[PDB]
Symmetry: D2
Subunit: 437 residues, 4 copies
């Protein structure tokens, strides 16, 4: 039981959601307090006994030893002051228990304000989320899809446009498109990093840096980069923008929202291809997670639900981001919750979708080819041999009798001087029609 009077009052003030800061947020706050103590010691402003104790307490917090010591609601003062002081109070208690007296404000918060610390910890968490969690999970997903694209490179089937019969494509081509959407997702997350990684630390109460030592922010960021291995962390381009607004969070959520849109398409196609068997498309078999197989598309359902959550969370992030006033945007804890949750859900579901659905998909190449070979969409190359009228009669009879176009052309007595069997086979070569590269 390590927090003190201030945190206790915040517990009483905000019984709203019953949920507090997440592991990554507590980690970031610990990392930040350690870096600030280090710099304050480097500069000779904080006595080494005090600093080394703070640095040790902060390392415990960062390592996840005191997650039970952060009871404050997400829905707290919009600067995150409550959680800032929560971290200061906890560090002080730990230091004192190791027989070193430090003041939560004067020592643990030395050279800092809430207004620059809580957004810094938020951006450390979000940058770490993008770089060390989500991008690698997206690469796992891109690789699974790309591997399918290769495996199925020659697996010809019918295209569908407007949900209607269309000319041939391969499953490999379609899956290459999904792989590109996830590759583009990775490009989209990376494109946000130059601004997501900007940190407010050193701007103090209003962005001017008053009561912080010269270059405090530069030095803290330097320590943070070396401790996290994230070179994307950087001092803000403009100290006022970095505290008056959280636009980088709005930007990064936009990339996550685009990824949610891509995943909705990929997952929807996958459950449709797996549908039926009798009542559906029965094109592929999904891994099952006395009687015939009927696998529910549970992972596609989890993906599409996660995407809806990201859409909603993204709307909440933008709403908070728009509503800053003057020197401070006071929607930080709510914005932090939503973007970090979006990173988490997308990271975790992308890996599961790749590994326990995509990877083990199967298809019947022989059957899918025989079906593409049955489509009215492929009769066009016959027009110059048999005329538009016979071609339409062929298409009708093929559908009615449930035969291939080839077989119907044979059945209707069209093989002869104007159309040989080998010419028929050439003009109706559905794999060639897919134009595989």
């Amino acid at each position: 039981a390590l927090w003190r009077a201030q945190t206790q009052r915040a517990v009483e003030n905000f019984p709203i959601s019953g949920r507090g800061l997440e592991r990554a947020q507590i980690r970031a706050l610990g990392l930040l307090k350690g870096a600030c103590a280090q710099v304050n010691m480097d500069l000779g402003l904080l006595a080494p006994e005090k600093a080394e104790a703070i640095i040790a307490a902060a390392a415990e917090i960062a390592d996840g030893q005191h997650d039970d010591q952060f009871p404050i609601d997400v829905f707290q003062t919009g600067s995150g002051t409550s959680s800032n002081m929560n971290t200061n109070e906890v560090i002080a208690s730990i230091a004192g228990a190791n027989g070193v007296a430090v003041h939560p404000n004067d020592d643990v918060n030395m050279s800092q304000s809430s207004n620059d610390t809580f957004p810094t910890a938020t951006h450390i968490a979000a940058t770490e989320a993008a770089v060390s969690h989500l991008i690698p999970a997206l690469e796992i997903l891109q690789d699974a899809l790309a591997t399918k694209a290769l495996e199925w490179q020659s697996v010809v089937k019918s295209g569908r446009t407007h949900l209607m019969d269309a000319v041939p494509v391969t499953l490999g081509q379609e899956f290459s498109g999904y792989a590109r959407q996830i590759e583009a997702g990775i490009e989209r997350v990376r494109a946000t990093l130059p601004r997501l990684g900007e940190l407010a630390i050193g701007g103090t109460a209003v962005g001017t840096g008053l009561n912080a030592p010269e270059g405090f922010g530069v030095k803290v960021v330097s320590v943070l980069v070396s401790q996290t291995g994230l070179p994307q962390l950087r001092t803000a381009a403009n100290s006022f923008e970095a505290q008056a607004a959280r636009d980088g969070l709005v930007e990064a959520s936009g990339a996550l929202r685009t990824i949610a849109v891509s995943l909705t398409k990929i997952a929807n196609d996958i459950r449709w291809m797996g549908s039926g068997p009798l009542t559906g498309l029965a094109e592929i078999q999904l891994p099952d997670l006395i009687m015939p197989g009927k696998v529910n598309p549970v992972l596609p359902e989890a993906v599409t639900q996660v995407a809806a959550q990201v859409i909603g969370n993204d709307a909440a992030v933008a709403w908070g981001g728009a509503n800053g006033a003057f020197e401070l945007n006071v929607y930080i804890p709510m914005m932090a919750r939503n973007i970090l949750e979006s990173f988490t859900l997308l990271t975790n579901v992308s890996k599961l979708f790749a590994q326990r659905c995509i990877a083990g998909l199967t298809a019947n190449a022989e059957h899918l080819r025989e079906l593409a070979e049955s489509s009215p969409s492929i009769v066009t190359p016959l027009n110059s041999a048999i005329g538009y009228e016979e071609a339409a009669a062929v298409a009708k009879q093929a559908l009615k009798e449930r035969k291939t176009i080839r077989q119907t052309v044979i059945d209707r007595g069209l093989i002869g001087d104007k159309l040989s069997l080998e010419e028929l086979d050439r003009r109706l070569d559905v794999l060639a029609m897919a134009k595989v590269e």
Copy 2:
């Protein structure tokens, strides 16, 4: 392999391994609703001679423990699970079977605990029970607390005249009471909006079984179960669905109810924003009212209170708006006989109910109730506005009235003092007539 204290079994444990996505499971209220439903189903199956009394009574007793919140640690499955909520349905069946078994009665999770049921009709039923209970027993009473606090303050401030603001610019007089009666109306209308959703929010799918047809459930199963649920919850809002296909193919009642919560979020944002603006400064702001200090510390400095409750309220509203977008997205995307976005939709709507309930009460009791106004002063300020010179026109002419306005601003004085200063009291008008014409409380036209 299952933990030793665990009352769940193999199907639940598989779902734990399949969906490690958010790390969050069903809320207390959803678990309670699953318990209530399973008890009521066992009661009806027993009533109808379909389930032997020894089995049914053990299931009913076990389901009551769940409903009473004794087993909230027995529901480990992620929110982001199969979209019908089958995993959570099975979780409930397994936990009930374990409880029954530990009491010496063997029951089958599917054949007995799920008798006459599907997951497709059970999970959306439990969802609508929880949402209806949230609206009726939690949110409406919290909104009533907030409405009453706003209305009490409006009466207290009935004669506290100040300048209106339109476009953020100086306007004619209003009272703080009048503005607060407007806030109270927004909350009163919020309650009306939630009540208007109840006829459809309260519809339950139970009895529709796998596809809405009621196949493999006894005739009138749904009607009988709903009757038991109404008796046990005291919620007469719970009813059988008007159409059994609509009630499974869609979750449109959740979308509708979320829309009401979204409107309330919009109202709360306006109310909270005004109150923190009125509290702003003191020196750089409007300094119209003082908010209760929720963070006092030892100090010999002038007071400066942060508007932490309006910040909590406005952040809650943002969350409700996001949650509402999430609900609508899941709601649109059903296919054929089943909408498979249920656990995600349930999570978002029930959270919006919880956040609004909790923050409305806090806002009412720890912010609204103790607001104070700077009143003799708000009045001096309204008495200084160029907005109030119009009623002088018919005594002194609009050109002199305009000069009065300009001089008042320049010398930072009341309109009244400026009229006196310019020597107009005499033949043009008496002091009593001036005071009648410039009575700013009267200009507010309090009803």
Copy 3:
């Protein structure tokens, strides 16, 4: 100022100040402004505040506007001052010009705007227009759609097919049952719109600048509303419950937009099912045929795109709604644009969808029944005669040979002492399994 222009100086300035979208008010918004100005002139006359000669010229000019004779006289951008003052003045100026050309001098502010402020006039016209749109346009179009769906539900009451849950094969239903579900969604949409009318019909008129009624006669609003009800035949129009709430907020528009948003969600499901039912034919479900306008499902596409627009419009309305300050919400023209567009799009596409898609659908009943009679989903009723192990084997062989369950039971030599042909047909009666009520 253009020669044929009936607007004057203030309007031409607004034209120059807001070249933003290049779109002005819609016909319905212009009409409502005309109705309002007519009603105000009538009341001011009744009260002896406005000379009859002036009032009658204003009344006649306002009626021309209400009748759509001057839809070209309102050039101001939607994106104008957020009270809609510019459009208010635009109306006053146009009326003055019409009166003038009929030989009667009236002052746009002192006469046409007598007893009024822009702050109570523009939202009043907005709510008149939205109430009119709901009652006289949308609900009648939804009724046409509900009737078309219900008609199909009846026509197809015995058209048995397999259900689909998770997109996977399920026990029998009828096309008629599914359409009854669609009809209920639309019936419920009508209830939803009706439920918003008590607050959508609330009008701010009489509240003047800040909601107090300063500079309007006692009971001005009630008297104006009385005239409006009498002219429009809309009993839903009413004075606001609270005059401050009615000007400080536009919550009734947020509420009404929420009902439109729910209808958009319902229409998305209905249109999606219909285009899937009509898909293929070869590569899809081939359940029904859509009227031609292999037909692409162009009306389901128009419906789903309209619903997307309504979702977006609704987000804009809520954003405006939350952001009022003190005595006035200044997002009215934008909010009005979006809600009124959503009414119009839903009205027009609902009628088209009903009359040019739903009404002419045809069902492929034999293909539907054949599939249902071939489903492993229907073997359960055989258990009590042949055992679940044999029932499983029937299901497997039926799938392998593409035969009905019935024929498979015969083919496996099960008819005789185990069960008779009559008993087999009773147990496998798929229409009976749908349990039509």
Copy 4:
């Protein structure tokens, strides 16, 4: 039955009758992109020897009239049409065929004007052309104008000290210049955000034909058409798609670009809200700055209201784009006309309002500098540097007395008799130097 002056034909008239939904057709920029595309296709088909030069040149000339805005009245089909935009594609082919015929050359709308193209790779190409042009040639230049206006104020007001505000409550000093530098950065970052979407916004589907495979287009048709488009538009951002299937099965590039516009809306909401608050009152508000005007003065903040309403529209439009984007199926996303409407409108609104806001509001702002500095010098926030001279007790007593009497800290220190051997006037003025507290870099 078709109107007399109409250059469209039967397929377009059927579309007019089929989709009477919104009553609104394509915008000028969309019609222009369709003409540009058709001209480029005819050029390439002629280059490849597939289209006779007389036909191709007639098509090229017609398409140029369309690209030049000469026939924006010939496109009557509703936005809410078939979701591939096939109807508008056919509308373009028919209008071109009519123009060619009026100029004495017979061409077939399908066989000639649509040669090598399909009903599914044309409309998304024209959409991405229009969106790329809008981003590069219209929006970014307008944001640069706004950035410059804000940056100019940041410099002009670099010494205009005032009190900071956090949580809406009094805070330590800043300058108006510093606050405006924050706004300028938001707009500069908004330009960075738009630029960041260009590698994917500029990808074009042309050449993929019906399903993305390029069936029935000549080898390299896409590459060749893109080269002509680049030369004609001067937009090197136009490029062939990385993956031809992704470019038709999805419109993810539009969702991405809409996200950047949404962020700009979020930034503009903050800047406009601050500006109208600064201009508020005069008596009831903050009265920090005076806005240009578009009895005593009381200017309504009309441009901040226009900006915040535009921002709301962009937010709604952005939701519509994402909803359409998510809902493709298999080889084609069929929400193209609706997505195009919304993203292109968001570009147009932000372009026009940004320029107006910059030139007709920001440029002419004036600051109440005396009142601002005097207020900063009156703040309890600035007494901390007195602690070491007069002690905590008197520093606090000074803050209280200053507020009560509506005086500066400086005058209150004098009034309390605190000037002596522990504190000179020169030292008092150093310690209470509010501009120095703003630490202007």
